[PDB]
Design a protein around this motif. Structure first.
Motif, PDB file in Angstrom:
ATOM      1  N   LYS D 309       0.908  -1.202  -0.105  1.00 25.51           N
ATOM      2  CA  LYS D 309      -0.043   0.078   0.166  1.00 25.51           C
ATOM      3  C   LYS D 309       0.779   1.144  -0.033  1.00 25.51           C
ATOM      4  O   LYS D 309       1.853   1.414   0.975  1.00 25.51           O
ATOM      5  N   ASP D 311       1.301   5.418  -1.405  1.00 27.59           N
ATOM      6  CA  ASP D 311       0.562   6.854  -1.529  1.00 27.59           C
ATOM      7  C   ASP D 311       1.245   7.620  -2.602  1.00 27.59           C
ATOM      8  O   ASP D 311       2.394   7.749  -2.754  1.00 27.59           O
ATOM      9  N   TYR D 385      -1.853  -1.178  -3.951  1.00 26.94           N
ATOM     10  CA  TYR D 385      -2.867  -0.507  -3.778  1.00 26.94           C
ATOM     11  C   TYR D 385      -2.338   1.057  -3.689  1.00 26.94           C
ATOM     12  O   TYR D 385      -1.098   1.335  -3.113  1.00 26.94           O
ATOM     13  N   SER D 387      -3.172   5.433  -3.425  1.00 25.73           N
ATOM     14  CA  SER D 387      -4.276   6.395  -2.990  1.00 25.73           C
ATOM     15  C   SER D 387      -3.798   7.672  -3.757  1.00 25.73           C
ATOM     16  O   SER D 387      -2.810   7.989  -4.255  1.00 25.73           O
ATOM     17  N   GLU D 388      -4.997   8.662  -3.887  1.00 22.62           N
ATOM     18  CA  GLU D 388      -5.009   9.843  -4.796  1.00 22.62           C
ATOM     19  C   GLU D 388      -3.906  10.638  -4.187  1.00 22.62           C
ATOM     20  O   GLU D 388      -3.152  11.280  -4.990  1.00 22.62           O
ATOM     21  N   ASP D 394      -7.461   9.799   3.146  1.00 28.39           N
ATOM     22  CA  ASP D 394      -8.428   8.712   3.207  1.00 28.39           C
ATOM     23  C   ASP D 394      -8.917   8.417   4.321  1.00 28.39           C
ATOM     24  O   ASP D 394      -9.982   7.942   4.539  1.00 28.39           O
ATOM     25  N   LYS D 444     -11.484   2.245   1.095  1.00 29.39           N
ATOM     26  CA  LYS D 444     -10.276   2.691   0.950  1.00 29.39           C
ATOM     27  C   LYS D 444      -9.068   2.096   1.782  1.00 29.39           C
ATOM     28  O   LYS D 444      -7.799   2.144   1.575  1.00 29.39           O
TER      29      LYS D 444
END
Lengths: 454, 454, 454, 454
Positions: D309, D311, D385, D387-388, D394, D444
């Motif tokens: 995960k 970002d 994964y 994330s924006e 999130d 998320k």
């Protein structure tokens, strides 16, 4: 000063056993399980390294964990003044000796099972009476009993009174050294108190002033004890007596004979009838020129069957002429508890000699036998057999037909008397199976039928 | 079909040892290390569970780790067509049998030390000649030798030929069961090849058709072997012969007597002179009415000192009257390898009898003794002793003064003859130390000076 | 209800040792012999399967067999009516409780040597005073103490209170099993009294309400104890705290840092200077966003050297604008036992931003640092180091000549500030031995010189 | 010169197992029975002291004694001229090398049962081809294989090529000494060939240039192998690379994070959801400022589930202004086997700064995310994964209602950014169970539902 007795209740295979003892003890038999328990019984009472671990489930009787275990030892305390060792067991103990004239002392061991923790405790008490027994003082892990006795254990398969316990000192020893061990144990004063277990008869050659315990083949509940002590007389022939009896102590049925003439005949007869007679007990014992009291009492106290066969005989008293003594009847009567008989005087002219003399003596002996039938009747009850003249004459009455086919000549009973050994060897060489079967069944040789069994 | 020999070179305490064998073998003696080493040596050659682990530093001789260890076993192959076991050792082996007429076969084991890795390899080789030996085929961990033999080991302290090894089967066995074991080994055919080690004399009561190996007390390099085989003429007296010899085999020096009259006298004399005679070897053996050949050959082949003392005697031939034979002289000549002597005929009037007859016979015996001085001189060299008349007359020549103080009477030598046993017991009761020391030193009783020692 | 203390005098390697205890105890260190003896010390006092066998020569001190061996255990007895176990230790004992208003209890064990028999005896005694101790009653092999306690021993290499003794429960266990075992011990109520010895840090992830004993590397005369009990404020971060401290408890020197940016630099510098820093003690510990009290007290009670290095910081109080609070200074002050400082309010025009704001804040921080020279000097005494602004500025002042050769650009401190992890990795990639030796010697990085050694 | 492979058939619990190897090998996992069998398998092939004793009934497969047991070892022979060890394995063997250009060698072991004698023989065979294998010469008890190899066995619970076999050297070793052992094993040249079995992660702190074998929890038929060899461009972060993977190698489900801020949140969330997440596998691993390739390949070859995960992020290239790089997207594309994307240049006026600058960059990142939906679709397939913007945004989309009740103020997402650690530790304190249950289920945060299990 002296051990007296031991009582065992509910310990392994002992139900209620009462055994007499003495300073020197020897145990033997064919059990091999009770013999090794009779020593743990003594070790749980006077030893420390084995009493720390208490009883378990197996150490009781047949796993019935609701009964007590009691062991009591009895000691005699008489030499209050002259004994060196009585002081030690009268100084350490100071409160159980109620009076100064007790003369007896006890030691006890009790045990009761504790179900919750799976453990059996051991409690020790002594005293001078059976009703008032007090507990042993002591703090920590040491009792007051350990300050008097010390126990030594010997087993090759691995200011205090010393007690020895020897187990089987013949595992890997030569035959010669067993005699040395016997001499040291029974003669020198290094050892005073001990217990001994053995399977070999070479350790008991110098046994004197001891106690013997025999264990039967049945349940352990039976054990027999006797005190062995040789007399002041019979002291010039001690070695032969001990050598003869040391092997017969390991038997169940024993027959007593006179000389080596009968041994050959009996061995041949038994070999022809049944060869396996020494496996199932059985033994042949030679006595010689001695009375039968010493063997008979020792064998009777230990529950050994005894059979005696003898022949009538006459001796001439030294100095006087024409006077004769009855030896055969006297030796048989001395065993039933009676007194000697008066001498018999007989007259023979000087010219008569040889076979004429022999027939006169035989007629006199037959008359003497005729006079005392009632005594012979009571003799036969207690396993005493008496012949009229001798063994050869009784033999002539059973195989007489075959007697006159080897010696030929004449009167073969006379021919054997010239030389007992060589001619008996010749006779036994030339004998068939039928002859032995005929000898084994005749009445005059009934004694053999009691050696083999009922 | 039959083992023949075994050779051991440089293995522990064996330097160069050569032992004969046969199908049944029994080893005994006093050197306990040598026997164990012998049986281990026999296992590094025929067992795989002990040969996996090679030799170590100690398994050599006294740590000279630069010498070969060689073991060779010899077997005789004669029954080429009838034996059911020779075919197996001709079927598995196919190349070593160079010719179909070999009759001898060998098995060998060699080893050389590897210093770098501290290990000694074992190499196996058979053959039918000592010069041409080939290696045994086999792949993995199994040789071709293991397809013929199987070894079984017994010790209570714990389509193929079977070899049994037994070590001390008497550790915790009763006396009766040892006899049963002896019977089973020596009569039944369940066992055919075995080796036995023992210290008790009850296993050798039915020994027949075997080899006996004796180990001396010195260095192991000495071992003696003999073949035991009872004749068909001494049958029916076998059971007594074996019981007599089985205890004498465990000694270092044995004296041969006639009857129980001499046992009492000699026991008393030895007890008064020195009481430790059965510890340093020593034994008294009873013969009876039989020749001495069987005992003497067996005792000589095994390196046992033998002493013989016998008396002159006469017998009357059956049927014919007045003719007599020389038994005592004859029995001493068969042992030297000679032939029997001619009969002697003597004449005695019918009127003369009794003591007058006895003195005539004694004079005749003395005259017979007077003509054979050379024979007696040669007899004495090989430890054979002969007396002129009998033991009692020899006794009278040493303690005569004390003879006429117990029996009183007159001519006590005649008095003893009436009853041998009782009167000798009475005589031995009334004797002092000086009397026994006087018997021990006289010339005519020199035999007792060789049983005590050198 | 609760154990309180234990005193050992003259037992093996213990001379005079006084150790505090509690219901749950954990022992660790580097000396394995002492950790093994510390459990036999308790077993000789509360267990009977080991007390039967008395002391030997070795069990004393260095073979001076003329001194007493005393072991005393102290228990606190306060819950006279609420406790369910005080009754069991107030009912079995009935005479040593002099008053019904006593609080402490004692159990003692003494031993004096007996030279004659080579055996030391053990004597047990309790009481409620140190001057009047009476002997424990009991007959046979069972004391009154065995009716209250039961001891259980666990070791993988092989109505009454229960005491557990666990030795090395990680010999052949996997990691997850260790964590599960830790949870079972420290969470459930099955275990209440135990002593535990361990070498692995996975059993101590959820230790709470226990007593920790540390053994130094020197003679056993030193042993340290501390009561571990976590607060309720630090309850949401318990796992991280325990995982951080569980490995540091096995060290001798520990340094405290803030985050992962200070780990890479120090690891590189130490690797370039000397690569053996974790074998000889040493450890790096990350704290994070908490205070230092919890680690510092626990480490100081057990004699572990602690080093702290921090940087000055300012953060804004929520809600109000323009007011800032002194964080690093307050966090350093809270360790010396003082109170928080007052807030400081600063004014900045809205238009001014960017690097100008940063330089204004840096000037304010420099003024704050200049205000408190005495406080900084007092901080430095107790191993607390404070930087003026941040680590980056000290690193610049150390190695700017090489810092201005990789990032190029300008003002590399800002370039580090934009992104910390990646830029520090890039910096550590491009460095030489000279730079690392230069960092290790500068005054501003003295802390490392204290971690390696003296 | 180099081992290559090993094949095991029908040995204990192995049915058909094929394992790759190299000079240094380390075996680990959960199946403790297979790990011992894997080392007995290497001693029946190369060790003399254990091959003397053949197989038994148990050493086969599940007691089906009618199938073969084959073990084959493969060794590569390339350095025909430079290797000092290839000469030894080409000089001792002189007939199995058909050609001087073979380059491969084999060693084999076969066994067939012998039902009659209850024994299994072992046959050895080498060769340079799989079709033509000849037998190994040797006479007596020593093969030709023992002249090349020597084997050493180490276990604390008790001119040739040397092979070491270590079993669990951590039974009673302190934590510091395990590192000392690891350094010697993996750095110095004393050891060249070995196999190692371990349960502790401190032995693997310096691993480099070795083989790792993992045993699954299922039947032994599964075993995975990988070659560990660190690159030269990661040499300054090596001491930190191996302190995080070493613990993860003992797990079954591992998640990868960036820093401690995520650790603080996830520990609390998991503790509230389910606390027994570490007993059943599971682990959290911090990466930092490095790419994910090194961890992912190592974990994938051994069959370990991996979850990633990350970002989105932007960095500024040094020197040039206004140009930015896409670090987060490239780090996810590099693992799928693609090339780095081109730079993106963005323009911002000098006056605009602060929160407006942050919102401009966030809008740019959102547009970049909108551009590449197809790539994210393929990323999510392989457990990656993205994330924006960041984790905080999130978080705001799941517990936003409770966000604005602790910090109050305004825009809490900005408030956290000022100081991440000190504010996350405050946020975690003031969170209820319902708040944590609302993070575990939102879309998320789907990563946490794959760590715990299916």
């Amino acid at each position: 000063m002296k051990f007296s007795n031991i009582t065992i209740k509910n310990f392994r295979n002992f139900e209620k056993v009462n055994i007499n003892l003495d300073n020197k003890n020897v145990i033997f038999g064919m059990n091999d399980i009770g013999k090794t328990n009779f020593l743990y019984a003594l070790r749980f009472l006077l030893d420390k390294e084995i009493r720390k671990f208490g009883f378990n489930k197996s150490d009781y009787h047949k796993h019935d964990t609701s009964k007590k275990i009691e062991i009591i030892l009895t000691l005699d305390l008489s030499n209050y003044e002259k004994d060196e060792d009585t002081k030690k067991l009268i100084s350490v103990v100071k409160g159980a000796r109620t009076s100064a004239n007790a003369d007896v002392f006890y030691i006890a061991l009790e045990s009761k099972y504790d179900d919750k923790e799976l453990y059996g405790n051991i409690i020790l008490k002594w005293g001078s009476e059976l009703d008032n027994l007090i507990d042993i003082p002591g703090r920590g892990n040491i009792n007051a009993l350990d300050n008097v006795f010390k126990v030594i254990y010997i087993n090759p398969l691995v200011d205090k009174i010393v007690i020895y316990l020897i187990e089987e000192p013949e595992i890997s020893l030569h035959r010669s050294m067993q005699i040395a061990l016997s001499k040291q144990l029974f003669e020198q004063s290094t050892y005073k108190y001990f217990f001994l277990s053995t399977h070999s008869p070479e350790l008991l050659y110098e046994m004197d002033n001891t106690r013997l315990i025999r264990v039967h083949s049945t349940e352990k509940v039976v054990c027999s004890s006797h005190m062995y002590n040789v007399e002041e007389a019979y002291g010039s022939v001690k070695k032969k007596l001990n050598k003869a009896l040391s092997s017969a102590l390991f038997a169940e049925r024993v027959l007593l004979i006179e000389g080596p003439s009968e041994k050959i005949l009996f061995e041949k007869v038994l070999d022809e009838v049944e060869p396996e007679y020494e496996l199932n007990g059985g033994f042949l014992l030679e006595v010689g020129g001695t009375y039968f009291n010493h063997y008979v009492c020792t064998l009777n106290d230990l529950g050994i069957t005894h059979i005696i066969k003898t022949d009538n005989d006459l001796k001439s008293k030294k100095g006087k002429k024409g006077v004769y003594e009855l030896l055969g009847l006297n030796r048989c009567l001395n065993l039933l508890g009676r007194e000697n008989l008066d001498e018999i005087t007989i007259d023979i002219p000087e010219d008569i000699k040889g076979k004429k003399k022999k027939e006169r003596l035989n007629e006199r002996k037959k008359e003497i036998f005729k006079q005392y039938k009632n005594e012979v009747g009571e003799f036969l009850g207690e396993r005493i057999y008496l012949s009229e003249i001798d063994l050869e004459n009784d033999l002539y009455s059973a195989i007489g037909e075959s007697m006159k086919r080897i010696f030929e000549n004449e009167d073969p009973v006379h021919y054997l008397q010239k030389s007992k050994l060589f001619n008996m060897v010749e006779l036994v060489n030339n004998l068939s199976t039928k002859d032995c079967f005929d000898v084994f069944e005749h009445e005059k040789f009934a004694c053999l039928k009691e050696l083999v069994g009922s």
